[PDB]
Amino acid sequence: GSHSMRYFHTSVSRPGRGEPRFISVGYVDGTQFVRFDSDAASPRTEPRAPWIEQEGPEYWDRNTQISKTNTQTYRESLRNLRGYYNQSEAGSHTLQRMYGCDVGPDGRLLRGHDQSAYDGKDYIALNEDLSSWTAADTAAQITQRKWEAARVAEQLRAYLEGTCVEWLRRHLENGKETLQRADPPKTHVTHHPISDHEATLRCWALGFYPAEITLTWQRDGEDQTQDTELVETRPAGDRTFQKWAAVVVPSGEEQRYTCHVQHEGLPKPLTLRWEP
């Protein structure tokens, strides 16, 4: 259905241990496809998914250039932000940015993104209009004023409405066999007695892509949101994801509980019960 391209930039200062490290990773949906690391022996934009490997040297050279330039810009920016917050030269700090575009099934721009954080806190973001900024504090207002004066929002809008969506559409075609394939979860319910009158029912989902999934437990048809333990969806390492949901139930009452599974790769939602 809908898709996204997103780049994730992390720059971290490390006083006494060289210049700040810059890492950029690119994703289409839940699939990483490139990386760049300023600490690499020979920093280069590198492929991380098979379908991107066909791009020619111009792609790799241009993206490498952009990332080397960005490395320096983020270093200058970290120096600036330290000043905006009256911070000493002794501490380590982090500047993060995530940017990119979302498209619908027809490939048209749904919306664009350009958001930044400093030391894990929201700093500045491009608004959905792709024309104005939201600054989190008086420090970010300095960046906002600079970016307004230089019409940076206009640059982002041009990139997001052009380059970004054009490349996303290209990636989606080149990687269609995986990027446009939803793999349904393999599911089962396990049962583990806790004591003489309580047992855990755990509903498993394995091998699914993309990561978006809904796993719920119902008791007599009512959602057990408060009583359900849901682990974070986790990567298996083969592109797929895993998740479980568990509920503690009175012994003998197991049949009043059903696990419901919703996922894009399923022909229809699943309703599972424990099978003794």
Partner: peptide
């Protein structure tokens, strides 16, 4: 491809 970003 990526964007060449501006200084904060």
């Amino acid at each position: 491809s990526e964007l060449e970003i501006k200084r904060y």
